[PDB]
Symmetry: C3
């Protein structure tokens, strides 16, 4: 998986170990080796949700395949829970866009996963 979180929460409010925790939790949820997991947290953003710049997040979760999608709900509970507990963002001010990529459309190590 590749998980990206864009948030207006400041850098100082992102706990030490947060990328580690995302990685470990994504490994547990997908059941796939953690060595392939990419995580990206982007704090201090100029963002609003519902016209308010209270804490919010816009996220992306990319997975590689064709039959992917069934775990989206489970991921939403997991990831909203992490953003709430760690970054103090209300789950109702988070969107997570899920993208199931074709292997031929993901590059890695000089080629693609096709």
């Amino acid at each position: 998986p590749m998980f990206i979180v864009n948030t207006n929460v400041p850098r100082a409010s992102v706990p030490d170990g947060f990328l580690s925790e995302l990685t470990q939790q994504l490994a547990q949820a997908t059941g796939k080796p953690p060595q392939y997991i990419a995580v990206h947290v982007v704090p201090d953003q100029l963002m609003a949700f519902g016209g308010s710049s209270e804490p919010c997040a816009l996220c992306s979760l990319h997975s590689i395949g064709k039959i992917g999608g069934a775990q989206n709900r489970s991921y939403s509970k997991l990831l909203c829970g992490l953003l709430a507990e760690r970054l103090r963002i209300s789950p109702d001010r988070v969107y997570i866009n899920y993208y199931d990529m074709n292997a031929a459309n993901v590059g890695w190590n000089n080629s693609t996963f096709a």
Copy 2:
């Protein structure tokens, strides 16, 4: 809808209240309340368009329906107009990628929309 603008315009030339302006304009364009509108503006970016570092933008509009058909062109007129008038970016140095999301691929508030 979720609207994201990445630009090399500096933060100081982003007007005060610009997030609210985007939200309001999208509320009018959609005919739906501001409540579920998310906006994200990213200034100060290292960008080039056409080999030039004159002001430019790369944008995304994600919507669960409410796009396609003649709506993408209408959005482009609205959103290029706003970026030209407020951020002083030439419309010919803006790209906007439109994404018609499936509700099952959008997470929010611990769940997904379908």
Copy 3:
């Protein structure tokens, strides 16, 4: 094409002229005029790949056509090669998401490409 690189390598490591280099290399690889190419480099990011904060990147290449099995493999060697040589990022710590955009779904200059 539109090429975006998100990386934890510092801004201070990005060579002067890297945006121009990416623009020219993309032109020659995709066969598209440099005048239409957008590049966006985002350094200093809070990222991990495989649980490690060693240099890594998450990239996107959007194109209206010119995306496919064989083309993407070639692009991956080219783009990993530039990230390795210029930014010192190992190719096995890079993902590139390729998006074949329909012209109807790309806004530009107050309108869309189709």
